[PDB]
Amino acid sequence: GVLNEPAGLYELDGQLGLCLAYQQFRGLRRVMRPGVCLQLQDVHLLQSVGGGTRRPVLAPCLRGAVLLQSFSRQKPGAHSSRQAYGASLYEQLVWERQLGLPLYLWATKALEELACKLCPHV
Amino acid sequence: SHSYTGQDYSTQGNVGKISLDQIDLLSTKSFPPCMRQLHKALRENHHLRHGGRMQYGLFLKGIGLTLEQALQFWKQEFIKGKMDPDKFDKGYSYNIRHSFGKEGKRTDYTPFSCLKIILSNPPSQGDYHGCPFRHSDPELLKQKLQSYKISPGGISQILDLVKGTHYQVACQKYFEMIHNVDDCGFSLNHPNQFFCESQRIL
Amino acid sequence: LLGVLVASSHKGCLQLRDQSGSLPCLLLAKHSQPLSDPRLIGCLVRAERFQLIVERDVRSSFPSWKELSMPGFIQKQQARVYVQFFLADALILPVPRPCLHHLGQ
Amino acid sequence: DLAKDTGNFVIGQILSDQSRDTIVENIQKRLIEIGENVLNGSVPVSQFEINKALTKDPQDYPDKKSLPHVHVALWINSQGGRKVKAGDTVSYVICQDGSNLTASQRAYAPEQLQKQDNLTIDTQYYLAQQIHPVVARICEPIDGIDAVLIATWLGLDPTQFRVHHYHKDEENDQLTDEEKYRDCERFKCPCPTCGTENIYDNVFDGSGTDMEPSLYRCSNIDCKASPLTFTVQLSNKLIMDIRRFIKKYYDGWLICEEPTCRNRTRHLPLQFSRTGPLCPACMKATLQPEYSDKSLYTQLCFYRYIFDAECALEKLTTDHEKDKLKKQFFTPKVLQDYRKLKNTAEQFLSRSGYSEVNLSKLFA
Amino acid sequence: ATPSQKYNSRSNRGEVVTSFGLAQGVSWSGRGGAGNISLKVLGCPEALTGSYKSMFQKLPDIREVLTCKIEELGSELKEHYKIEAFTPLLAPAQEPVTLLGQIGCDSNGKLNNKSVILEGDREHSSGAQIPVDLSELKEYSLFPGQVVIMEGINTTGRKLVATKLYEGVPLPFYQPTEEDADFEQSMVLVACGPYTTSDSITYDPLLDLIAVINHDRPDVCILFGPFLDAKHEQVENCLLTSPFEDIFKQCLRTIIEGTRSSGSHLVFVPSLRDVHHEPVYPQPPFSYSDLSREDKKQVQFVSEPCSLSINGVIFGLTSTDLLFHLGAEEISSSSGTSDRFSRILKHILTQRSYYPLYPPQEDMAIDYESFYVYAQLPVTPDVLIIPSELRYFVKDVLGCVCVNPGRLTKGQVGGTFARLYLRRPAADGAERQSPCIAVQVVRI
Ligand code: SF4
Ligand SMILES: [Zn+2]
Ligand SMILES: [Zn+2]
């Protein structure tokens, strides 16, 4: 799961929505692609919560960090240029106004739709 | 065990658009032996029997050229061989056109699959429609294939499987050789799929 | 509601504009004293408690009062639409041109 | 005479060793000429004599008005002082009067044909029922030369004629989507407000990236009602339509096979043979159902097809098209309404006829 | 207003228009649901609990079922009739000769007195057909599907001429116990459909009915469909702004509710038009899945057709249009005086069927390969009810009880409904003391 291609919010099982919240994971932001298999422990599952979705939300309170043990032989494409370039704002967005995470996902959605409406033709 | 494949991959109206002139040029590098030899034949004769064309004919829809364009092609190859320029209308071209009409459904409205040019349609004297690897007698065929500038070792290992009466693989190994690529990429079942491949590698 | 308010040398009226297109809108500077300020022209604009209005006109030819559930007597269906909203609650911003960063009377 | 002798030469043609190509050629020019020589009205009425027999008094037949010759018996015994009775025959012909009536009764003694003016002896009927069918009996199964081709050599009257196919013997040689359906009957639909009509063939309404759901907008360009919001009404017609298809089958006609006899009845006779039962008149031929069950199940699949958009949505290739359209207008509501009507259809066939194959009787 | 305006102003309510039996008054009344209520849907052939599994037939098994019918019937008749043997139908020989077969049309549609044709079983005569005629003969009554014995003189082989037509036979009815049925008087009312003048959706007549019901406290009533016709103009223009099953549900809910007051039993007879229920025949019993739990003791559905048992008395339950159909085809040489009805009754009696007409009318679809095993007369019954489009009447015919109740609403105007009494004696006699006591056709 490649939720926010620019801000590279990433999850497993296709259905474990997950976002590297506080880790300054610069290295893990231009690397990933489908085909990688990794390990993890003790990360919250948010369900019976709703408000945006009821799917198995993954919430990483940074106890079990990322466990890199695999790659994925996959070369890049040619389109991400117009649909990924510039997410750096995200990096402080949480630190911006101490963002709650369901709020965070909702705001990401808002930014998606915004970009659809305005960026970058204006 | 009959004249339906796995399924209709190389069916009606797949990828393709090419002008007439280029056909012959592509022939020398893209026509599976059956077709290739039949096209040579009609290049010489400029005439064909009641059934024969009804293979080659539908085979052309493989690349899918327009009727009036295909009609023009056949006209060239017809009257230059002295077929009355009036008969053409009420004769051959008539059915050639209808070949894209109402009835023909699964009978004519389709291309052919080797398991229809093998398991049936006996080819008669001096005619050309039909699987060479089956109907062409062995050593005449040996020299014949060899005339495609082929290493005799390949020809031999091919004729082996040929008398093993399993032929698709023979067509396969032939193509494998003539383009030297050391994978068949697939398991061929339809000449038009063969064609779409041969154009893929370009 | 949100877009950029733009006028036109060809309709001479409000139009909320976005990449997707535009829409006829109706600002309201409060207390019946409306906008004469032309700086807002061509700027990002937003509003929340609005009103969306639609106008329906039809070419009906109904004969009587017991066919009022019988389709034979209706030809044209013109549909007007527009937005109505106060300016006094506007959320405003200008466009910082995203770029490669006497005479006159 | 024309039909009989035409077909007689037809069969005579095969009786020599000319080429299959020569076969076609000779069996072609002659055909075209025979079509034209009447298609441009250049042959005397003498060349169309229709002599037919008689069994009882004209009124005896439960077809008081339903044979293409008994009508003339009616005439001859109800119009003149000339008697016609058992063991007699009628030398008539079928003659159009430009009156859009059945061919069942525009039958005529030719003496009035040569007398009046508006007696246009119908040179349409005499092709689809005299020359063609006779040629069909014999010439048909020749390689390549197939049924409609004969048609398109005499008179291009295909659509009506197209339905005749000899469609039971296409097995000598698993199917794409559509032409599993093509020869079925489409779904027609009445508009609740604009008065126009509609047809609902495939879920998407036409072209590619433009594609839109069927039930969205009435087809008539101007009017702007949206038929979706009348799901329930659609529901009605759906049932109120299917509940005549079944009506046909359990009442299934029975029809003849030998392409000359062409009898239609229901009183199933009792003798039997390889293919099944045998017509009482053409005692040398089989009998076939009319609405072959294969149709009925085909049609019910055809309905269940266009109400189950979910499938066709999933099978779609291009990512961005899918995502954009779903973003556009696939609510839970619209989906749910499709779901509802599709559900009605599917349950109504799977109720019990055909999708089952009772293995417990198939391996004993 | 315009709904039932022409109806609500009727001047005939409660009027006893025709009736028959012993002397019985106006204020008919019964014990509601007091205790002894004998009720059961009998059968050595099952009573159609579930649904079919059929949408498609298989041809030669039709022939099979036709055959088995012809054979069994012929054999059971010949047993009583002490005749030796019949003839392979194509060995012409000028003597007295007795034949077995079934009658049919030669041509597309109807008949005459000069086109009857015969066909024989699979076995007894090798299975072929022969034309016929009866001009020389005197008195007959024939119609398709009907199996019969005949006698003629076969001269040419492919022709014959009749000499005589021996008579059909009924089976003896149920001869029940003598400890169970020793019961009292009893009132049952019944009425068919449709249930409006064919321009509204009100069920005003249903209101009047349920009013009469609550008034008179009957043992059990039974109400044939079809509770929503399709040929009802209000439907086949695709009008009603609702689903259908819903409307069924409503116009059932109203009945069950209003009835629950007067404590009486109800049983439903489905028919071939309640569009939510598929149109096959015979018909599984209706579907339903929301009962006021306390009433699974009271109201039970049945199949179409069925054969029901009250106090050890029998009822034939048809939701057909039979009498009109057989009217549409029959031929009888009799021309002096004849109740057409009486005759068609007599026929419907012996053939063990509910629909001996075959080929079937251009709509009244059927499906044999269950029809023969689900809806053949388990016993020659005692009482028979049969809707129609024909004028109501009542007959006692040869230890059989029949009533044309007529419809409820003849197009846009008033109509009828049927009511009857039951009791059985407790000794011998003519051995068939009519369990039917007396019958009233009371106009709406
Ligand atoms: S694969 Fe079959 S059709 Fe193709 S060239 Fe070989 S024999 Fe002919
Ligand atoms: Zn409309
Ligand atoms: Zn026949």
CA–chain centroid gap for E255, Å, is 24
**D130 DSSP 8-state letter:** I
Q: Is B117 in the pocket of ligand 1 (CB under 6 A)?
A: yes
Distance CA D121, CA D105 (A): 13
Residue B124: exposed, middle, or buried by beta-carbon count in 10 A (0-12, 13-18, 19+)? Answer: exposed
User: From the alpha carbon of B172, which atom of ligand 1 is closest?
Assistant: 1
For D266, nearest residue in chain E (alpha carbons) = E359
With contacts defined as CB-CB under 8 Å, which chain E residues touch D354? Answer: 55-56
Strands E116-119, E93-105: pairing kind: antiparallel
Q: Is B158 in the pocket of ligand 1 (CB under 6 A)?
A: no
With contacts defined as CB-CB under 8 Å, which chain B residues touch D23? Answer: 50
Distance CA B191, CA B111 (A): 9
**Through-space distance between the first and last CA atoms of chain A, rounded to whole angstroms:** 30
Instruction: Please check if B131 is assigned to a binding site.
Output: yes
β-bridge partners, E320? none
Beta-carbon count within 10 A of E302 CB: 21
Q: Is the peptide bond before E282 cis (omega within 30 degrees of 0)?
A: yes
Beta-carbon count within 10 A of B21 CB: 8
Best mutation target, D193, D217, D230, to test chain C (most C CBs within 10 A): D193
Q: After which residues is chain A broken (C to N over 2.5 A)?
A: none
Give the closest residue to B95 by CA, choosing from D6, D183, D142.
D142
- The answer to whether E90 and E159 have CB atoms below 8 angstroms apart is no
If you search the block for the tokens 């699979």, which residue do you land on?
E122
Backbone φ and ψ for A93, nearest 5 degrees, come out as -50, -50
The Å distance, Cα B34 to ligand 1 centre, comes to 6
Distance CA E119, CA E117 (A): 7
Residue E177: exposed, middle, or buried by beta-carbon count in 10 A (0-12, 13-18, 19+)? Answer: exposed
Contact with chain C for residue D198, Cβ under 8 A: no
Give residue D232's region: left, alpha or beta (phi > 0; psi -120 to 50).
Answer: alpha
> How far apart are the CA of E379 and the nearest CA of chain D, in angstroms?
28
Question: Residue ranges of the alpha helices (H) in chain B?
Answer: 22-30, 33-44, 53-60, 67-79, 87-90, 92-98, 114-117, 132-135, 138-146, 152-163, 168-179, 191-200
Give the closest residue to E14 by CA, choosing from E436, E419, E402.
E419
- The answer to whether C44 and C6 have CB atoms below 8 angstroms apart is no
- The answer to whether B198 and B30 have CB atoms below 8 angstroms apart is yes
**Rg of chain C over all Cα atoms, to the nearest angstrom:** 20
Q: Is B114 in the pocket of ligand 1 (CB under 6 A)?
A: yes
**Through-space distance between the first and last CA atoms of chain D, rounded to whole angstroms:** 59
Give the closest residue to A103 by CA, choosing from A24, A21, A23.
A21
Which residues make Cβ contacts (< 8 Å) with residue E279, sequence separation at least 6? D243, D246, D247, E272, E273, E365
Angle between helices D147-154 and D132-139 (to 10 degrees): 150
Residue at E319: amino acid letter: S
Give the closest residue to A50 by CA, choosing from A106, A11, A3, A116.
A106
Angle between helices B191-200 and B168-179 (to 10 degrees): 20
Contact E129 D280 (CB under 8 A): yes
Residue of B2, B11, B49 lying closest to D173 (CB–CB) = B2
Give residue B173's region: left, alpha or beta (phi > 0; psi -120 to 50).
Answer: alpha
- The answer to whether D288 and D254 have CB atoms below 8 angstroms apart is yes
Distance CA E434, CA E18 (A): 19
Contact E275 D351 (CB under 8 A): no
Q: After which residues is chain D broken (C to N over 2.5 A)?
A: 173
If you search the block for the tokens 């009508």, which residue do you land on?
D71
Which residues make Cβ contacts (< 8 Å) with residue E256, sequence separation at least 6? E266, E292, E295, E299
Residue at D220: amino acid letter: N
Distance CA C41, CA C22 (A): 14
Residue at C91: amino acid letter: L
Contact B107 D25 (CB under 8 A): no
Contact with chain D for residue E164, Cβ under 8 A: no
Beta-carbon count within 10 A of B167 CB: 17
What residues sit around ligand 3, an ion, with C-beta below 5 angstroms?
D 261, 279, 281-282
Beta-carbon count within 10 A of D234 CB: 22
Beta-carbon count within 10 A of C63 CB: 9
Token pair belonging to D211: 């594609």
Distance CA B158, CA B143 (A): 13
Residue D300: exposed, middle, or buried by beta-carbon count in 10 A (0-12, 13-18, 19+)? Answer: buried
Contact C74 D194 (CB under 8 A): yes
Half-sphere exposure in the Cβ direction for E394 (13 Å, CA): 17
Instruction: Please check if B114 is assigned to a binding site.
Output: yes
Angle between helices B22-30 and B33-44 (to 10 degrees): 140
Distance CA B100, CA E5 (A): 64
Token pair belonging to D289: 């159902």
Q: After which residues is chain C broken (C to N over 2.5 A)?
A: 101
With contacts defined as CB-CB under 8 Å, which chain C residues touch A116? Answer: 19
Token pair belonging to D6: 């035409």
Backbone φ and ψ for E185, nearest 5 degrees, come out as -60, 170
Distance CA E250, CA B82 (A): 82
Best mutation target, D224, D226, D233, to test chain C (most C CBs within 10 A): D224
Token pair belonging to B85: 């320029």
Distance CA B166, CA B133 (A): 9
Distance CA B146, CA B163 (A): 17
Residue whose CA lies nearest to ligand 1 atom number 4? B191
Q: Is B60 in the pocket of ligand 1 (CB under 6 A)?
A: no
Structure-determination technique = cryo-EM
- The answer to whether E408 and E93 have CB atoms below 8 angstroms apart is no
Angle between helices B138-146 and B152-163 (to 10 degrees): 150
Residue B23: exposed, middle, or buried by beta-carbon count in 10 A (0-12, 13-18, 19+)? Answer: middle
With contacts defined as CB-CB under 8 Å, which chain D residues touch E51? Answer: 351-352
Q: Is B32 in the pocket of ligand 1 (CB under 6 A)?
A: yes
Distance CA E186, CA E265 (A): 13
The Å distance, Cα D141 to ligand 1 centre, comes to 28
Task: Give residues 50 to 79 of E whose Cβ lies within 8 Å of D.
Answer: 51-57, 59-60, 62-63, 66-67
Q: Is B58 in the pocket of ligand 1 (CB under 6 A)?
A: no
Backbone φ and ψ for B42, nearest 5 degrees, come out as -70, -20
* CA geometry: angle E398, E404, E409, nearest 5 deg: 175
Query: Closest ligand to D226 CA?
Result: 2
Distance CA D280, CA D261 (A): 11
Residue whose CA lies nearest to ligand 1 atom number 6? B171
- The answer to whether B158 and B170 have CB atoms below 8 angstroms apart is yes
- For chain A, the farthest-separated pair of C-alpha atoms sits apart, in whole angstroms, at 44
Query: 3-class DSSP state for residue D111?
Result: helix
Token pair belonging to A16: 């474990």
Give the closest residue to E362 by CA, choosing from D63, D251, D288.
D251
Residue whose CA lies nearest to ligand 1 atom number 2? B114
Distance CA D94, CA D113 (A): 10
- The answer to whether E318 and E385 have CB atoms below 8 angstroms apart is yes
Q: Is B34 in the pocket of ligand 1 (CB under 6 A)?
A: yes
Token pair belonging to E85: 């043997």
Residue whose CA lies nearest to ligand 1 atom number 7? B131
Backbone φ and ψ for D325, nearest 5 degrees, come out as -65, -40
β-bridge partners, E222? E190, E267
- The answer to whether A52 and A9 have CB atoms below 8 angstroms apart is no
Question: Residue ranges of the alpha helices (H) in E173-289?
Answer: 204-216, 233-236, 245-260
Cα–Cα distances in angstroms (integers) from residue E32 to residues B78, E58, E187, in the given order: 96, 49, 9
Residue D80: exposed, middle, or buried by beta-carbon count in 10 A (0-12, 13-18, 19+)? Answer: exposed
Distance CA A12, CA D212 (A): 34
Contact D251 E363 (CB under 8 A): yes
Query: 3-class DSSP state for residue E393?
Result: strand
Distance CA D177, CA D195 (A): 32
* CA geometry: angle D195, D196, D201, nearest 5 deg: 140
Distance CA A14, CA A3 (A): 10
Instruction: Please check if B184 is assigned to a binding site.
Output: no
Instruction: Please check if D301 is assigned to a binding site.
Output: no
**Through-space distance between the first and last CA atoms of chain E, rounded to whole angstroms:** 20
Which pairs with CB-CB distance under 8 Å and at least 24 residues apart come from B18-21? B18/B63, B18/B65, B20/B65, B20/B69, B20/B72, B20/B73
What b/e string do you get for B63-92 counting C-beta neighbours within 10 Å, with b at 16 or more? bbbeeeebbeebbebbeeeebeeeebeebb
Q: Is B171 in the pocket of ligand 1 (CB under 6 A)?
A: yes
Distance CA A74, CA A33 (A): 7
Instruction: Please check if B196 is assigned to a binding site.
Output: no
Residue of C18, C95, C98 lying closest to A117 (CB–CB) = C18
A near C: at least 3 beta-carbon pairs less than 8 Å apart = yes
Q: Which chains touch B (3 or more CB pairs under 8 A)?
A: D
Å resolution of this model? 4.6
B near A: at least 3 beta-carbon pairs less than 8 Å apart = no
Residue at E346: amino acid letter: K
Angle between helices D147-154 and D20-39 (to 10 degrees): 40
Query: 3-class DSSP state for residue E152?
Result: strand
The Å distance, Cα B31 to ligand 1 centre, comes to 10
Q: Is B167 in the pocket of ligand 1 (CB under 6 A)?
A: yes
D near C: at least 3 beta-carbon pairs less than 8 Å apart = yes
- For chain B, the farthest-separated pair of C-alpha atoms sits apart, in whole angstroms, at 51
Question: Does an H or E element contain E94, and which?
Answer: strand E93-105
Query: 3-class DSSP state for residue E342?
Result: helix
Which residues make Cβ contacts (< 8 Å) with residue E156, sequence separation at least 6? E92
Contact with chain D for residue E280, Cβ under 8 A: yes
Which residues make Cβ contacts (< 8 Å) with residue A76, sequence separation at least 6? A33
If you search the block for the tokens 């306390």, which residue do you land on?
E294
**Rg of chain D over all Cα atoms, to the nearest angstrom:** 27
Token pair belonging to E138: 């005197």
If you search the block for the tokens 């339809």, which residue do you land on?
B190
Distance CA E374, CA E377 (A): 9
Contact with chain D for residue E230, Cβ under 8 A: yes
Residue at B135: amino acid letter: H
Token pair belonging to E425: 């004696």
Strands E39-41, E306-310: pairing kind: antiparallel
Residue at B16: amino acid letter: G
Half-sphere exposure in the Cβ direction for B162 (13 Å, CA): 23
Residue A14: exposed, middle, or buried by beta-carbon count in 10 A (0-12, 13-18, 19+)? Answer: exposed
Give residue E352's region: left, alpha or beta (phi > 0; psi -120 to 50).
Answer: left
SS3 content of chain D, % helix, strand, coil (to 5): 45, 10, 50
The Å distance, Cα B134 to ligand 1 centre, comes to 9
Half-sphere exposure in the Cβ direction for B181 (13 Å, CA): 11
Residue whose CA lies nearest to ligand 1 atom number 3? B114
For A119, nearest residue in chain C (alpha carbons) = C19
**E123 DSSP 8-state letter:** S
Which pairs with CB-CB distance under 8 Å and at least 24 residues apart come from D326-332? D329/D213, D329/D216
**D222 DSSP 8-state letter:** S
Residue at C16: amino acid letter: L
Distance CA E283, CA E52 (A): 9
Question: Residue ranges of the alpha helices (H) in A25-89?
Answer: 80-84
Distance CA E116, CA E113 (A): 7
Best mutation target, D19, D148, D157, D177, to test chain B (most B CBs within 10 A): D148
Token pair belonging to E434: 């009519």
Token pair belonging to D29: 């020019």
Distance CA E98, CA E115 (A): 20
Distance CA B85, CA B78 (A): 9
Token pair belonging to E261: 């007051």
Distance CA D6, CA D37 (A): 13
Distance CA D141, CA D288 (A): 19
Q: Which chains touch D (3 or more CB pairs under 8 A)?
A: B, C, E
Beta-carbon count within 10 A of B46 CB: 15
For a ligand 1 pocket test, name from B120, B167, B187, B196 the mutation site with the most ligand atoms within 8 angstroms of its C-beta: B167
Distance CA A45, CA B48 (A): 74
Distance CA D238, CA D299 (A): 13
- The answer to whether E320 and E354 have CB atoms below 8 angstroms apart is yes
Contact E114 D63 (CB under 8 A): no
Residue at D318: amino acid letter: T
**Through-space distance between the first and last CA atoms of chain C, rounded to whole angstroms:** 39
